[PDB]
Design a protein around this nucleic acid. Structure first.
Ligand SMILES: Nc1ncnc2c1ncn2[C@@H]1O[C@H](COP(=O)(O)OP(=O)(O)OP(=O)(O)O)[C@@H](O)[C@H]1O
Ligand SMILES: Nc1ncnc2c1ncn2[C@@H]1O[C@H](COP(=O)(O)OP(=O)(O)OP(=O)(O)O)[C@@H](O)[C@H]1O
Ligand SMILES: [Mg+2]
Ligand SMILES: [Mg+2]
Ligand SMILES: [Mg+2]
Ligand SMILES: [Mg+2]
Ligand SMILES: [Mg+2]
Ligand SMILES: [Mg+2]
Ligand SMILES: [Mg+2]
Ligand SMILES: [Mg+2]
Ligand SMILES: [Mg+2]
Ligand SMILES: [Mg+2]
Ligand SMILES: [Mg+2]
Ligand SMILES: [Mg+2]
Ligand SMILES: [Mg+2]
Ligand SMILES: [Mg+2]
Ligand SMILES: [Mg+2]
Ligand SMILES: [Mg+2]
Ligand SMILES: [Mg+2]
Ligand SMILES: [Mg+2]
Ligand SMILES: [Mg+2]
Ligand SMILES: [Mg+2]
Ligand SMILES: [Mg+2]
Ligand SMILES: [Mg+2]
Ligand SMILES: [Mg+2]
Ligand SMILES: [Mg+2]
Ligand SMILES: [Mg+2]
Ligand SMILES: [Mg+2]
Ligand SMILES: [Mg+2]
Ligand SMILES: [Mg+2]
Ligand SMILES: [Mg+2]
Ligand SMILES: [Mg+2]
Ligand SMILES: [Mg+2]
Ligand SMILES: [Mg+2]
Ligand SMILES: [Mg+2]
Ligand SMILES: [Mg+2]
Ligand SMILES: [Mg+2]
Ligand SMILES: [Mg+2]
Ligand SMILES: [Mg+2]
Ligand SMILES: [Mg+2]
Ligand SMILES: [Mg+2]
Ligand SMILES: [Mg+2]
Ligand SMILES: [Mg+2]
Ligand SMILES: [Mg+2]
Ligand SMILES: [Mg+2]
Ligand SMILES: [Mg+2]
Ligand SMILES: [Mg+2]
Ligand SMILES: [Mg+2]
Ligand SMILES: [Mg+2]
Ligand code: NA
Ligand code: NA
Length: 530
RNA sequence: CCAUAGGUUAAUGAGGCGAACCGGGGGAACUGAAACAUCUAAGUACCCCGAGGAAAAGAAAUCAACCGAGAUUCCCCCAG
RNA sequence: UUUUGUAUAAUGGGUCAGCGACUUAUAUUCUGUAGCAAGGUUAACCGAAUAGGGGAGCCGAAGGGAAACCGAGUCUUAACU
RNA sequence: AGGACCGAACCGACUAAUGUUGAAAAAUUAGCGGAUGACUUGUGGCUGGGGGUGAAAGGCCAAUCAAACCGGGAGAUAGCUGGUUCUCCCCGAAAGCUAUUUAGGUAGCGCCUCGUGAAUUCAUCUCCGGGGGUAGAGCACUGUUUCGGCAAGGGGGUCAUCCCGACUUACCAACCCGAUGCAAACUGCGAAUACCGGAGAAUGUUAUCACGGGAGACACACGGCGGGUGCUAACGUCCGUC
RNA sequence: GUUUAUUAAAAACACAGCACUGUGCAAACACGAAAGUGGACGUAUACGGUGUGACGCCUGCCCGGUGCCGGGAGGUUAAUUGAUGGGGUUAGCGCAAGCGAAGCUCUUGAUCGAAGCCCCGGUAAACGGCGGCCGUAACUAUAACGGUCCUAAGGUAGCGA
RNA sequence: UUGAGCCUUGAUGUGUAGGAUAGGUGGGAGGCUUUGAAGUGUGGACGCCAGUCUGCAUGGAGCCGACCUUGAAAUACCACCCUUUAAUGUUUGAUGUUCUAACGUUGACCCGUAAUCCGGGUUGCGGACAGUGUCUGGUGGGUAGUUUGACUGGGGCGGUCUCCUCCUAAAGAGUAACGGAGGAGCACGAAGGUUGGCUAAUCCUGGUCGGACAUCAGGAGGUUAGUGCAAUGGCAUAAGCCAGCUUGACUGCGAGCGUGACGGCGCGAGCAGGUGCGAAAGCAGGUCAUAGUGAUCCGGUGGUUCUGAAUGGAAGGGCCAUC
RNA sequence: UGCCUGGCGGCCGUAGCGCGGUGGUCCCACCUGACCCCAUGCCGAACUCAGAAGUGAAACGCCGUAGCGCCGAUGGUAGUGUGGGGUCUCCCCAUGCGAGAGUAGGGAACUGCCAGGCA
RNA sequence: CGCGGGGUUGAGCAGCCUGGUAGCUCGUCGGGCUCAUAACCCGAAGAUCGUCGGUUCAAAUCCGGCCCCCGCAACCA
RNA sequence: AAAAUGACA
């Protein structure tokens, strides 16, 4: 079973995590939780050996095939989907490709023949004969068609190849699964399939997830990464959240009721110390006061960012109008004969879930995706704040966080007012010196929220604004957008964030759009969903 | 019911005292540590039991070092 | 006697006579003296025995290093002018 | 009838005097409270030491009680007090520094003494080579101070009190200039002494240094000079040197 | 009535009366290393512990703290049990390095595990506690009155230099 | 009744592309059915719901591998097994009801006995509970041993206790007071090394917002500025300010000194081995210097044939680096 | 050898500032150009290169001047080692040492080694 | 002046709790309901966070001085 | 459901 001892990673002048030593193993599944920027991804990198710790150890058995997940790479793109999911087995992939190379190079001499016979028997023991079949029976579960199973990695879509990268990790029942945010930008049906296929396995799995309904579904232990110490509570999710609460409140109460007695042994020392017949008794109360040592409270890293979008110039009457916006890439009718008029104050939630033009509507509205036919007439003064689903291009350039946030300073504000946004977004003194490239996913979504806030738009378009954000962030931004007085266009899958704030639903089905004029609860009752 | 428990008679032995030495059952504290609790004083003082002219121990399931010695007890070194 | 300092009004003693306080054992070191002198000396014990025997053993003539080890050298160091 | 009333025996002990080496290691004299009751008394018995008994005071347990008396461990320990016994000859201190559960104890060093071994070793004076920053002094610097000159600028009165300031100002006033002082924590100056080193005589029973045996002492006092504190008070208190 | 025999005889102690609490009998409680004794040759109208101290009128509010009583769902938790992992040794395969069966060993400690504590409620003739600031009435004065903060609750009847 | 282990028996473990809900080995492929059928007449359970397993029979005597699409073949079947399992057995557990036989009886009767002790015998009632022993968690002033600092203008309170800078400090060093004043318990991968260059404060005159004070251009001034941090001493050859390259913020040593009662602390040319900057002479063993810190014991981690209690190993010690 | 000039020193204001004058054959400075060898947080202003029309304006060197800076006696004063004295918070006497400020005054340097030109 | 607790709109108080948001209950002011007042409903007003300085991009918060108010304390033989 | 008050003459 995997063990870690005193990992202690540190880049800067503040503790990140200290003397982490924990045994992971035994078939238990450890949901690893924390704040949006504490330690989780750089800890599953350490557990897999991607970066060695500053000073520490990670111990694994001589043969224990780590099945870990991507989302630190996107561009393998040299071979077919079948042989892309195959190479999750780093052992079998090498023997397979090496024997193919040997077959390519002439001839099978005695060095070549004896080099190849044992590799062939190794392949047989590893059952590579039925490797592609078992890979395909998993690609079908993920949702990739049989007729294009054998297509190269350029045939696949950019939003469809993360599916294959997910399928790679859990290929052939590998013990110890390092899953790093697997359910992000996935649908309800795929999430249900994944949480069903992980429920039939005896393999320790350490999973990062910022949602509650998946951790509370699959996980057994609830390893935390807050305060610095990795506190592991054996609990589902709710018996962790109801245990840490009283664990912290007991500490607070003990400090209160132990300071309240120092304040009582102090009223005697302050009154009878100078006396002669009572100084002996007043200088033993001082010993009692000094021998108390109330224990310290360190604030949790969770916190709650203060986000609020305002609007510089409110605009009246219609804010948008879309007239005959038929468009499709290679399936033709991505959305057929769209026709709509968006008023002011609308909170339009565009639903519909998977591969259909759930996005590319927002891309056409902003204009970066030219439509096939139609014209989109924004309001006269319409200023659009765009939060793209894939926002890497704005951080590939490596500026300091301060300069990156200062790019968008407007006419009438200082770099005193620039740093206030970062302060409200919880970038304190060193995390404003990091390169913009090296930041967490949630710490990056927040940094885009602080650019929208800084620009102060009157039309907000947001492609999945609930990505890599913990409960605190999707509770702050939810009310930040609720208080918003303006036009909002957003898309999300979780049936809570969209239901909290929406006055109109426009969801597209791969044959025809359907529009509504009420909130999501009425939408479901009219659909026939209980 | 047999039988045991119990009763009577007879034969033999013991009982108490004594200075030290000896074997065993229990077992302090002052004191030293420049305070004190681990530790020392010390298995000492003292209490109790038992025997002897002495008592205990004693004839390797011991040491040694692959060379060997040969029960126990006491004295001088090893050795502060 | 104790004190920086007592005629001190600081302590002790009424006087006489007798008793009353740096000792003994074993180890170690330095001085003096005596014997022997790269040698010196025995302990227990035997012994008609303060003689003689007994040299088990102790101290000294070689040191350096934590140690193996080397040895008028040795340790340090990869090596030391 | 009565934990009833007055009052002797009987039990007790509120006040005063005497007595304090007493008649007595708690009493006598004149008064005083209870006196059929939770009373008082004779004889015998039981409870024993961290234990007894206690209408409760730490009271009583053989003139002894916040832990009896006797014997033993025992000659407990005492950084504290006292005492320490015959004679002569030579040398002869310290009451300081450092450390201390340390401050009236002790350890190392400084000072004393005995032995051994060594070089003009050491001391005084004359001459030569040195570094000061004290006394004194000075006011360029750091502060402080009083005058006089020029006065930036600043407060006050009149008028459109939008401006510009159109004015004024008996009043304040920095920086510079000339004159006059003060400073432990000021110095563009600067002694006497003292101290370090070298050379030279004369003088001094090696007075110098090293090693080894034995210590004592680490409570100081006053007087002159230089000073901190105090009141330039104290036979006050804390340092330097004699 | 008792008390410091021998400097204190009192307002101190005891008391009848009152209340709380323990005790179902081989009672609780005490003296005992234990046997056994007192309680008691008694049986809840009896016995022990604690406080108050005839009698008359009465004995207010607070369960946050500390005790005591009841509750057991949940968390933590000893001995006991010893699943796993790591190391030592070595029959052998290799005369290279090196691995290394069985056994014996050193260590690590999964699982089981009660009371207590955390938690929930009660109890004050259980130990105990019982508030600040500001304004306001026909002359002055004072506030019956009002605002607010805090507390577990803010000292009631009676008495008061 | 309910946990857990084990054994025996039977099921369940399609997505394609297949006749059809095939688990992997491979034995065979011609074998399964008449001690009485594929279908039928009819039960229940399971499910990706398409389909599988089972009682018996009026009748019943016949179904599949050969083909075929797959990486792979078939309830023709048996085998040794794997996952989820269902049932009966068997092992210890937990719980609850009964029982008597250990154990209790300070219930009744008889005897030793002329005995409200004790013992034995019948009987009744409790009954594997209570109680006792070893180990163990809680409570435990009921009891016992003890600790509860020093300086100090008497003691107590207040203040202080180690390190750095100035004055007292009497022109070498040192020098006290509960004397007068301030600081430290770090920081910096550049604020370290080298090479190349550069020189400040403060006013005086001319200009957009622009002002007494911002940037510009002249002149006076002279280090009155600056130094990561308190003060003192320094600093122009700059130790102050920029830039290029770099890691000497190296290893073993070290003549000779300074300062301490010691433990110790500090300065150091030069030597050897390997570097950096510079063309080169050369400079670099952290920073302008002085604060930024605690012995020993005990223990942890890494290296090293030094030792290894018969011998070969090992534990354990030692040494080096470090916590 | 005499004069001028350049480099390296000695010495460090009696040596430095201010005012006036003067020097271009050589030397020195300014000077022309800049693609390139090099360089500017922009600018050949600085650093650097190829040359040489002009000038001695500025800088530099030399000479003259006291308006500053600077040096500075003699005498007296203060202080002080040793020995004495007083009316002793401070002084005095014998003896030895003897400033600081100020005054008279001095004063716009002196000098070595090479290398060029005019002699 | 030795030690604590404070100074936040007119009154009484949070926010200091590890600097990025100035808030509560009552009150004042202007409307509405009412015959009229009170209550009630709506809208707004106002604080140099006692006053000075310091690192700080940013102070009420962190540090120090000064002033004011409330409690103490300044011992025994 | 909440609804208090109105000097004398
Ligand atoms: N190179 C880097 N330099 C500085 N900080 C870094 C660097 N790489 C990562 N970090 C920091 O490490 C942390 C990583 O946070 P982490 O990835 O666990 O966040 P998350 O959003 O919770 O994770 P996840 O993406 O897995 O859901 C962040 O605080 C990030 O700033
Ligand atoms: N850049 C592109 N180049 C080519 N085809 C594209 C591109 N972007 C999208 N597509 C095609 O258009 C389709 C629409 O994708 P779209 O972004 O609308 O999906 P989605 O519902 O937002 O996906 P998801 O939730 O997985 O991110 C894609 O599935 C793909 O086939
Ligand atoms: Mg006998
Ligand atoms: Mg002792
Ligand atoms: Mg002692
Ligand atoms: Mg015998
Ligand atoms: Mg004396
Ligand atoms: Mg005296
Ligand atoms: Mg005399
Ligand atoms: Mg006398
Ligand atoms: Mg005396
Ligand atoms: Mg006398
Ligand atoms: Mg006599
Ligand atoms: Mg005698
Ligand atoms: Mg030797
Ligand atoms: Mg009577
Ligand atoms: Mg009477
Ligand atoms: Mg009477
Ligand atoms: Mg009496
Ligand atoms: Mg009396
Ligand atoms: Mg009488
Ligand atoms: Mg008595
Ligand atoms: Mg006692
Ligand atoms: Mg003794
Ligand atoms: Mg004695
Ligand atoms: Mg003499
Ligand atoms: Mg003493
Ligand atoms: Mg002076
Ligand atoms: Mg002393
Ligand atoms: Mg002394
Ligand atoms: Mg003295
Ligand atoms: Mg004196
Ligand atoms: Mg009395
Ligand atoms: Mg009472
Ligand atoms: Mg009451
Ligand atoms: Mg009884
Ligand atoms: Mg006690
Ligand atoms: Mg003792
Ligand atoms: Mg004291
Ligand atoms: Mg000095
Ligand atoms: Mg001196
Ligand atoms: Mg001295
Ligand atoms: Mg530096
Ligand atoms: Mg340089
Ligand atoms: Mg430097
Ligand atoms: Mg420094
Ligand atoms: Mg061995
Ligand atoms: Mg052995
Ligand atoms: Mg070892
Ligand atoms: Na990440
Ligand atoms: Na998308």
């Amino acid at each position: 079973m995997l063990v870690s001892s005193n990992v202690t990673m540190q880049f800067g002048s503040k503790p990140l995590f200290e003397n982490i030593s924990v045994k992971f193993g035994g078939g238990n599944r450890y949901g690893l939780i924390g704040a949006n920027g504490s330690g989780k991804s750089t800890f599953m990198k350490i557990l897999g050996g991607d970066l060695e710790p500053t000073l520490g150890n990670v111990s694994l058995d001589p043969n224990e095939r780590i099945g870990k997940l991507r989302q630190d790479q996107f561009a393998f793109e040299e071979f077919t989907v079948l042989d892309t999911v195959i190479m999750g087995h780093k052992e079998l992939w090498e023997v397979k490709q090496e024997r193919d190379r040997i077959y390519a190079l002439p001839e099978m001499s005695e060095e070549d023949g004896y080099k190849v016979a044992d590799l062939e028997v190794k392949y047989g023991e590893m059952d590579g004969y039925s490797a592609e079949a078992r890979a395909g029976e998993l690609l079908l579960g993920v949702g990739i068609p049989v007729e294009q199973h054998y297509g190269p990695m350029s045939e696949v879509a950019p939003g469809w190849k993360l599916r294959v990268l997910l399928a790679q990790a859990l290929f052939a029942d590998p013990d110890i699964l390092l899953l790093d945010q697997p359910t992000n930008n996935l649908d309800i049906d795929t999430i249900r399939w994944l949480e069903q296929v992980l429920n039939e396995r005896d393999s320790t799995m350490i999973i990062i997830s910022h949602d509650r309904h998946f951790l509370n579904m699959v996980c057994t232990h609830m390893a935390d990464l807050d305060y610095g110490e990795l506190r592991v509570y054996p609990g589902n999710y709710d018996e962790y959240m109801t245990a840490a609460t009283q664990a912290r409140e007991r500490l607070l109460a003990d400090n209160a009721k132990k300071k309240a007695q120092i304040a009582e042994l102090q009223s005697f020392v302050s009154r009878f110390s100078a006396n002669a017949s009572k100084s002996r008794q007043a200088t033993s109360r001082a010993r009692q006061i000094d021998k108390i040592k109330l224990e310290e409270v360190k604030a949790s890293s969770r916190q709650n960012p203060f986000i609020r979008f305002e609007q510089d110039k409110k605009l009246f009457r219609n804010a948008l109008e879309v007239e005959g916006l038929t468009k499709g890439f290679d399936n033709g009718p991505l959305f057929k004969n769209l026709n709509l008029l968006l008023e002011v104050g609308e909170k339009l939630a565009v639903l519909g879930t998977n591969g259909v033009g759930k996005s590319t509507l927002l891309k056409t509205l902003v204009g970066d995706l030219q439509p096939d036919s139609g014209t989109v007439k924004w309001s006269e003064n319409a200023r659009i704040g765009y939060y793209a689903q894939d926002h890497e291009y704005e951080f590939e350039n490596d500026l300091t966080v301060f300069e990156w946030m200062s790019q968008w300073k407007q006419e009438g504000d200082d770099e005193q007012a620039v740093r206030s946004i970062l302060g409200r977004l919880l970038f304190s003194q060193d995390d404003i010196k990091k390169p913009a490239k090296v930041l967490s996913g949630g710490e990056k979504g927040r940094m885009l929220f602080g650019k929208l806030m800084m620009q102060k738009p009157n039309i907000l378009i947001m492609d999945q604004p609930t990505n890599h954000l913990d409960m605190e962030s999707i509770e702050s931004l939810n009310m930040a957008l609720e208080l918003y007085q303006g036009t909002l266009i957003f898309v999300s899958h979780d049936r809570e964030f969209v239901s909290s704030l929406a006055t109109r639903i426009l969801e597209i089905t791969p044959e025809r759009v359907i529009d509504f004029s009420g909130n999501y609860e009425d939408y479901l009752r009219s659909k026939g969903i209980e």
